[PDB]
Amino acid sequence: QLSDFQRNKILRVFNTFYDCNHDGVIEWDDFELAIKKICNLHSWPTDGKKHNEARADLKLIWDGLRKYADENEDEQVTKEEWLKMWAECVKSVEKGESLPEWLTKYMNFMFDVNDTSGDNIIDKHEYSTVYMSYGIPKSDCDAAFDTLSDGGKTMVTREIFARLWTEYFVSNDRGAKGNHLFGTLKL
């Protein structure tokens, strides 16, 4: 079973990042909102390259998510279904397996949404630009970024971002850096 700490990390991500219209379930309509929000944030032209690519990528991610979590096949993922899926995913990451492919795709999507300069590094300004748009206070973006980059000793490359992303979802260690990947947690 997920510890309180894991369960709460996994709920907080459902609630802030996936359920964009905040009604308590994840559907395709949420991903339609997530596309609008990222288009607004970055000033992408509707039906331009980035927009059409974001839509295609998120379709694949939603499809893999529903496949894993949508037990009653109603095209909606409730918190119950999301927690049931996560308890099984975490067990498996511990037994040695990679996270599900919809989750890695979503990690790579969010990496590139952050890295608007395209140099393979998320810098402090890129990071706070994205997380502040989800309601993360700026001081929790800046404190998170220093934690994640080990105060500048580590560049937040796609690979670092991917390893921190797995740690956020599975770690039971309160000390883990990836706990703060989505804004500092007070622990």
Q: In this complex, which beta carbon is closest to Ca ion, that of residue 5 or of residue 116?
A: 116
The answer on whether 123 is annotated among ligand-binding residues is yes
Residue 80 within binding range of Ca ion, rule CB under 5 A: no
CA separation, residue 132 to residues 37, 60, 127, 140 (Å): 12, 26, 8, 9
Q: In this complex, which beta carbon is closest to Ca ion, that of residue 93 or of residue 121?
A: 121
> What length does the chain have?
187
The residue ranges of DSSP E strands in the chain, in sequence order, are: 25-26, 77-78
State the minimum distance, in angstroms, from the CB of residue 67 to Ca ion: 11
Instruction: Report the candidate in 90, 65, 95, 79 with the shortest Cα–Cα distance to residue 3.
Output: 90
Choose the binding region for Ca ion from 27-35, 44-52, 135-143, 160-168 (rule: CB under 5 A). Answer: 27-35
State the minimum distance, in angstroms, from the CB of residue 96 to Ca ion: 29
Choose the binding region for Ca ion from 39-47, 88-96, 115-123, 165-173 (rule: CB under 5 A). Answer: 115-123
Per-residue burial over 57-72, b = 16 or more CB atoms within 10 Å of its CB, e = otherwise: bbeebbebbbebbbee
Torsion angle defined by CA atoms of residues 34, 131, 2 and 22, in that order, rounded to the nearest 10 degrees: -40
Choose the binding region for Ca ion from 5-13, 65-73, 143-151, 170-178 (rule: CB under 5 A). Answer: 65-73
> Residues marked as binding for Ca(2+)?
19, 21, 23, 25, 30, 70, 72, 74, 76, 81, 115, 117, 119, 121, 123, 126
